[PDB]
Amino acid sequence: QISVRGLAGVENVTELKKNFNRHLHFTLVKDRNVATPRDYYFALAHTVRDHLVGRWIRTQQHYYEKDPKRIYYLSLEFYMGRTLQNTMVNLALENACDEATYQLGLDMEELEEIEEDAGLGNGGLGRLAACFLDSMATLGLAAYGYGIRYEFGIFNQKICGGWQMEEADDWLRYGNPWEKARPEFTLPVHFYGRVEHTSQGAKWVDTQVVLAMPYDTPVPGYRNNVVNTMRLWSAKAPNDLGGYIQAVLDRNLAENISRVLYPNDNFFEGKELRLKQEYFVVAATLQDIIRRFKSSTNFDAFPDKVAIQLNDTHPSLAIPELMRVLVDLERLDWDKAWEVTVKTCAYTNHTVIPEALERWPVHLLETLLPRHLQIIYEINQRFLNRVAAAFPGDVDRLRRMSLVEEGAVKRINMAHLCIAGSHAVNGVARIHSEILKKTIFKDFYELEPHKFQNKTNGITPRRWLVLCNPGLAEIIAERIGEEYISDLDQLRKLLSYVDDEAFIRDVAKVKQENKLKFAAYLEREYKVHINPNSLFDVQVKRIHEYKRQLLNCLHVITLYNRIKKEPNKFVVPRTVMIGGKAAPGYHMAKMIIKLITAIGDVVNHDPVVGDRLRVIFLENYRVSLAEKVIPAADLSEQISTAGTEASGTGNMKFMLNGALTIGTMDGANVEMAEEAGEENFFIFGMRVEDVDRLDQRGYNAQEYYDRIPELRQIIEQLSSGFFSPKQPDLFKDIVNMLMHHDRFKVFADYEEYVKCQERVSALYKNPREWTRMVIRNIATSGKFSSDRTIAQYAREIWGVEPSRQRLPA
Amino acid sequence: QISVRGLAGVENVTELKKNFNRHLHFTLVKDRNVATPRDYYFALAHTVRDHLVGRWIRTQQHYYEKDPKRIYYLSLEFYMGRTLQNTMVNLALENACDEATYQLGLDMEELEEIEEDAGLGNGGLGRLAACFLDSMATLGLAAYGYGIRYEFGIFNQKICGGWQMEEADDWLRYGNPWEKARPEFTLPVHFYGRVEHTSQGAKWVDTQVVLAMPYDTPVPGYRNNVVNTMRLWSAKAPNDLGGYIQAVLDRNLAENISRVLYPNDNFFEGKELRLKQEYFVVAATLQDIIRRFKSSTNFDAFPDKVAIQLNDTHPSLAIPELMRVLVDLERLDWDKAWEVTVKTCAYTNHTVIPEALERWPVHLLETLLPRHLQIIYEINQRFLNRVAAAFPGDVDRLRRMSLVEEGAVKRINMAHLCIAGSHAVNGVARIHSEILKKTIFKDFYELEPHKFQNKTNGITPRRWLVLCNPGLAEIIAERIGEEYISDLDQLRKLLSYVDDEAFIRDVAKVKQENKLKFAAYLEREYKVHINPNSLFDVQVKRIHEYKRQLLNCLHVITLYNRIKKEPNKFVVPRTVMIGGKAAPGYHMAKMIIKLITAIGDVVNHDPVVGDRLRVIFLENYRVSLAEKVIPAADLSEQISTAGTEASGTGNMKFMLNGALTIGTMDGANVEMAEEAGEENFFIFGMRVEDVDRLDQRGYNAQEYYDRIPELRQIIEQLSSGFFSPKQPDLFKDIVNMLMHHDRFKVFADYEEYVKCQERVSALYKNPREWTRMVIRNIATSGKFSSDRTIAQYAREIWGVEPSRQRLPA
Numbered sequence A, B: 001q002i003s004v005r006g007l008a009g010v011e012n013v014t015e016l017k018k019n020f021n022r023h024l025h026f027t028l029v030k031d032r033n034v035a036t037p038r039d040y041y042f043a044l045a046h047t048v049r050d051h052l053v054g055r056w057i058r059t060q061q062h063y064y065e066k067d068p069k070r071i072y073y074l075s076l077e078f079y080m081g082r083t084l085q086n087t088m089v090n091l092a093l094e095n096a097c098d099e100a101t102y103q104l105g106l107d108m109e110e111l112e113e114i115e116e117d118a119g120l121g122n123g124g125l126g127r128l129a130a131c132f133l134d135s136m137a138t139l140g141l142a143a144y145g146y147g148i149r150y151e152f153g154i155f156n157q158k159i160c161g162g163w164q165m166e167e168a169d170d171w172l173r174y175g176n177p178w179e180k181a182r183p184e185f186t187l188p189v190h191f192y193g194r195v196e197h198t199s200q201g202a203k204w205v206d207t208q209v210v211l212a213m214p215y216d217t218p219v220p221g222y223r224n225n226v227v228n229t230m231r232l233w234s235a236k237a238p239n240d241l242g243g244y245i246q247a248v249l250d251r252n253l254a255e256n257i258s259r260v261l262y263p264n265d266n267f268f269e270g271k272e273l274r275l276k277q278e279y280f281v282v283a284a285t286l287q288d289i290i291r292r293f294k295s296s297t298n299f300d301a302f303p304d305k306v307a308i309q310l311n312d313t314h315p316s317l318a319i320p321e322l323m324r325v326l327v328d329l330e331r332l333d334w335d336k337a338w339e340v341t342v343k344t345c346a347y348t349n350h351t352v353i354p355e356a357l358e359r360w361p362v363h364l365l366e367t368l369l370p371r372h373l374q375i376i377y378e379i380n381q382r383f384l385n386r387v388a389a390a391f392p393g394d395v396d397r398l399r400r401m402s403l404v405e406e407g408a409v410k411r412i413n414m415a416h417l418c419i420a421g422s423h424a425v426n427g428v429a430r431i432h433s434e435i436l437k438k439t440i441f442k443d444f445y446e447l448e449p450h451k452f453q454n455k456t457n458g459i460t461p462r463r464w465l466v467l468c469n470p471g472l473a474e475i476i477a478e479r480i481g482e483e484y485i486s487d488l489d490q491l492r493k494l495l496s497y498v499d500d501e502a503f504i505r506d507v508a509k510v511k512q513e514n515k516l517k518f519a520a521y522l523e524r525e526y527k528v529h530i531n532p533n534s535l536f537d538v539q540v541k542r543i544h545e546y547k548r549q550l551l552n553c554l555h556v557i558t559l560y561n562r563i564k565k566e567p568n569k570f571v572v573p574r575t576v577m578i579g580g581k582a583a584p585g586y587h588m589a590k591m592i593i594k595l596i597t598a599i600g601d602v603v604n605h606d607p608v609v610g611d612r613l614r615v616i617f618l619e620n621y622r623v624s625l626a627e628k629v630i631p632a633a634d635l636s637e638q639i640s641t642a643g644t645e646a647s648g649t650g651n652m653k654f655m656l657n658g659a660l661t662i663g664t665m666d667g668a669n670v671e672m673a674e675e676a677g678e679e680n681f682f683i684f685g686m687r688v689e690d691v692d693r694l695d696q697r698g699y700n701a702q703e704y705y706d707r708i709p710e711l712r713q714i715i716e717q718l719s720s721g722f723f724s725p726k727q728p729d730l731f732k733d734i735v736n737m738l739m740h741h742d743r744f745k746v747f748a749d750y751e752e753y754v755k756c757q758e759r760v761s762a763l764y765k766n767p768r769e770w771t772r773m774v775i776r777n778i779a780t781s782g783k784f785s786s787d788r789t790i791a792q793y794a795r796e797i798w799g800v801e802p803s804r805q806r807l808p809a
């Protein structure tokens, strides 16, 4: 149908249909008369999967031959989403399969909706891991993603009475056609036990053993015939034992390690099961890495053949684990082992929020990982000796830099451990990386300035443009070709069409079609009722106080009160859409969701408002839902308090898909505004410096309450029970928090936010100019491609050169 | 190579090799340079599996068209063993695949050894279910086997220090290529809750729900293109919730239902988890049966379209469950529902041993299945009213026949429930069925004589002759053709070759080759050391006191003592092989195993004995091991105390494979001797009548101890520590039991057993005559084919006619 989806050859379509029927018959064991859409989805899935295997086997064979430096990306999260369409896109089979399925009397995009999301992540951090695997494969890097195969990913969110309800996400129920179990490569992982010191060295004994079974999933590069591997570990008990029965039933205890993903976004919870997950993935991955290395005995060349990237501190145990293996098993001397470890490891920091920092109680590590605690203490001692030698007499510095935090309960600061054992430490956006050097890690930056770098996040243009917005990818290709898909910088050529009347018409037309399609889905599923002509105001991301969905709520209420104030006055109609999940134990986040639905209950049924304002809460926000709502958005809400959102990635997705952005100078927003020009961005609120000055004199919410009539009115409505008639004090926690314990200064940005919002309503009533500004955003979003991000990691951290060279098909 | 394995067509072998390479590449995602024997086994497995699907789909389609009466075989056990070779045999692909694999440079029988046994059974009862499915498919019956998909079957047995060690049997570890998960047909099963009585009737509410997911495995008939289904249920928790995490982790509680097979052979253990398994399989199976029935509303025709066979009392809850559905859900009146239930259900009894009888505590049923207990009480009342009307004033009869046993703890006698709700009740061998009418169920037989029948057990000649003893199947085919394979009675034609010098030579040659092959395996695996010229004395079956492995032990010790008595005297050399598993909590059974290995420790290292006597304990006895040792046996030990072994099936396997039998007049042994002629059998010991007379005056083991010098000597050696130097009193329990609490009268049969054993040694030293007797056994073993057994069930119980009609390929 459209150019960017490849061609549908006669020979190709015919071969596809043949294999489709083969799988339906032999693989699914079904006939056309009993098959359901699900069966058809699977037949197609296995059909596409077949085209991957040849390339997968050749790619791995290629790496074995050339033996290039290997890149290992360790993460406890890989927010993959659906795999069917992304595979067709990267293999250029989309139109062929679409045709083939058409000829068999089936609607392909109906089948695509049947696929379950691989929701093995919480949000930003996990999606970044997913975009990275895609870019690394597209750039010909010999990379491997290593993680855990959770049988239950992020919970499915349901709203009952306006409240969030969590439901188990049983994504493996009907099977996963993309994975290949590899029981033959099962590895043992040890826990507990004790340490014995002999004349030969230290020995970790009397440990409990848990087996790690790997499952490999193919990661296809963009039309270069490269297929990398994502290896996920699953926990299994040894066959070798209350009673015979109970012993068999207690095997579940060991296998619970890979049972479910901890649903916390940017929040640390020191539970033992979580620590086990962290060590489990690290211990299994390193044995696999060393094994593959020995099949290419001095490890002096180890860092020339291996690079280990730590996605946050979650897999930080890789550092002492690597030392344990090199020292205890291979028997290299400490200093040699340490040198190799630092040259091999790199750490990526994702937030400066204190409650997200991993600090493990020493008594936990002591019981669960005896030898690792000893190694950590040893690392700390040698590290502190260096600090003392560089800053003689600075005793407070020693205490601040220690990997060990003193107090009622001793803890290990995993971030300090990562900095000490890595040759590189990077933030995820320029402003975030600076903040790391100026505040949180100032002492470390002073000792080893060379370790600190910046690597601004990015998103993959394949899934976030071609796959989810074919219409836009097409009209762009028409003007500048398809080369941009693997080189986003080329989108700048679109700057010459900003005054092109035809282009302006097409951009606006694609947006309109996307809105109509989403408006339909919103009514087809969830029986709702939006107006496709209104401005689509959307804020989708995990529910958090620092992300300030509450500030958005205050705007919505302000808009509503102004309409009731002057009903016959004209106002640009809007459809305000807020979506995202709240961690199960985050009370305030759960209240915010209930408040959003409560506002919707009042606003959406007030006859005076009509279809001028609607407040929709998007249920179960996930990768597949993001692919639908983002292309249909007009306005992207990125309003975190300056200094709190390390980078953000959702912001980039919206820029690439034609939405204008209203946000604070935080995270990557700064660089985005910088790339597109501040005039083409809706910036407002305090800058980082303003927040600091305010914390200086002390933030008093009362002040804003007394000086802003409209703000006062909103709080009073909340307190009196205007949005909760049957439970007048339902939102007392929210009001109390905003008035007395607001760590994120919501009130401080209210005035400028409302004014700025008026500025967007004004630009929207002039279609031509709004679209032209949109074109300036899309045209300058090239820098936010994860291909650019990965190319910088490769050259500045891993020491490998990216390659666009097509691999033999 | 051999005729009975089908032909290897040029076109066939070429197509097989092609698909083999296809699966290795696309299915296993491997290349010839990294593939292991396991990968090759799987490529071949998927290749053979492909040939089943076409027939499988057509067979099920055929049944949907003709809509014949359906047969449902409910069993908590299906001891299937390996599936690869059995599938090739029934599809006539053995030689083709053997050739195809040969040309690819692979040894096919090496690959067959890689397949894990599907050990979902304990012994006789479970294997019978397996032989039955095979026969029902071979006879064109629209039959379905229904059970539970245990993820852990019967434990793997290891011997440490002569003691049995149990190890989890993780048979699904590398995957099961034969099964097809059918998540789309998942059904809910209810537990707990309470009963509410409305004006509309009774309602079971506030129950806990557990989902039943089916897995279908194909059951191919013998070269008739019929492929039936065995549907096994797996327990799964509903997605709809201590904490979010704990709720997800507690899903394991519900899924534990199908986690492991209870390892008890002929022994009842009243655990709650077992009751759940029993109801789980019954509740899911009946909804499936009714659903399929409604897709052909009065159930008056239900018994014309459905037959439900209960394999023992394990699935006895099907009776009140069927009533519950018909009365509570469909709303038929009690009397109508009951009529339908009785006409639909049939019960097969497997033992008269009191400790094996299922008697569930009322307090258990009351908590777990509230409504079923009420229905059972109601059934009991109406039943007792009929007893009272037929035997007025016989108050003791009422108490003996009640489904409810009174006492400190009320219990429900499931066998009484089965008899009451079934139109047919059968024993598994003539003598066993008579015993049921004379003793255990005498009262029931008096009330409804028409319900009691006999259906002597049988074994499938496919797996137990063609598959495990190709050499013997071949020399037989040479003389009378291949028709016998699906009509064992034809083996009688072999009676005319009893004097044929050539045949006699071939029979003896096949036996010799089988012994050489087993002798090798015994040394290749387990590093042992037997003499292929000695007589192979074997007793393999579950370890039990009633099976009397102990009597065998006494013979072995007698033989040893006689050799040390007169070292230079000649004696027919023997290799005594005893094998079998003991239930984990059966102390005495564990001691018997230790005693066997202990005797081996003394006998196998006594230089004076030389290679004239060897005592081997066959480790981990299972279906695949039976396929190897049975064809190599010379003497089959079937020495249970008269009246205790309901039938036995191992005895038949040995008859069909060329071994002579030494046994008591018990179970099917009686009919076997009857078929072959008592002169061609080695019968000894007390008859049922003799055991009774002895219980009358009272069994005093002391008497035999005082009158038999050799017996006395053996007990003294045991007591003094002759077979346990480091632990002189190690076997005090055994001696004490034999002397004071022997329920099975071991001593009572010792003298006749030893004498009879001398008779076999005498016949063995005359090769020609021993072989001729062997030919008379093989020639008359036709009656013990499970095809004959199934044909009788079909005509005398289910009301359906068997068919040998080839189904279109």
Ligand SMILES: OC[C@H]1O[C@H](O[C@H]2[C@H](O)[C@@H](O)[C@@H](O[C@H]3[C@H](O)[C@@H](O)[C@@H](O[C@H]4[C@H](O)[C@@H](O)[C@@H](O[C@H]5[C@H](O)[C@@H](O)[C@@H](O)O[C@@H]5CO)O[C@@H]4CO)O[C@@H]3CO)O[C@@H]2CO)[C@H](O)[C@@H](O)[C@@H]1O
Residues within 6 Å of the ligand: A374, A376, A377, A378, A379, A380, A381, A384, A398, A399, A400, A402, A403, A404, A405, A406
């Ligand atoms: O094998 C070499 C080494 O072994 C032995 O030393 C080990 C210790 O026995 C063991 O406890 C561990 O030491 C840890 C210590 O337990 C831990 O608390 C931490 O101590 C740091 C503080 O974290 C740091 O703040 C600073 O403490 C200041 C404190 O802030 C300030 O308020 C005031 O109280 O002064 C304190 C000390 O000046 O420094 C301490 C000390 O570094 O970290 C320690 C090292 O990781 O590990 C040791 C080595 O493995 C033997 O005892 C030793 O002789 C051998 O050299």
Ligand SMILES: OC[C@H]1O[C@H](O[C@H]2[C@H](O)[C@@H](O)[C@@H](O[C@H]3[C@H](O)[C@@H](O)[C@@H](O[C@H]4[C@H](O)[C@@H](O)[C@@H](O[C@H]5[C@H](O)[C@@H](O)[C@@H](O)O[C@@H]5CO)O[C@@H]4CO)O[C@@H]3CO)O[C@@H]2CO)[C@H](O)[C@@H](O)[C@@H]1O
Residues within 6 Å of the ligand: B374, B376, B377, B378, B379, B380, B381, B384, B398, B399, B400, B402, B403, B404, B405, B406
């Ligand atoms: O709805 C119809 C019916 O409902 C109610 O009756 C029900 C009972 O309330 C309920 O308990 C249950 O009755 C069971 C009884 O609980 C159970 O113990 C059993 O009783 C049998 C004995 O098993 C049997 O041995 C025999 O008992 C003898 C005993 O051996 C002897 O030693 C001496 O003690 O005399 C005894 C009685 O003569 O008989 C009893 C009685 O049958 O079985 C009972 C029936 O299953 O279920 C009842 C019906 O569901 C109402 O109370 C009743 O009026 C209604 O007709």
Ligand SMILES: *Cc1c(COP(=O)(O)O)cnc(C)c1O
Residues within 6 Å of the ligand: A122, A123, A124, A127, A540, A541, A542, A621, A622, A623, A626, A647, A648, A649, A650, A651, A653
């Ligand atoms: C990209 C994405 C995120 C991250 O969004 P931010 O606004 O940067 O927090 C979270 N969830 C999903 C499903 C995403 O696609």
Ligand SMILES: *Cc1c(COP(=O)(O)O)cnc(C)c1O
Residues within 6 Å of the ligand: B122, B123, B124, B127, B540, B541, B542, B621, B622, B623, B626, B647, B648, B649, B650, B651, B653
């Ligand atoms: C046939 C068989 C049995 C039953 O043997 P009996 O001697 O009748 O108890 C038990 N186990 C296996 C593995 C069998 O093949």
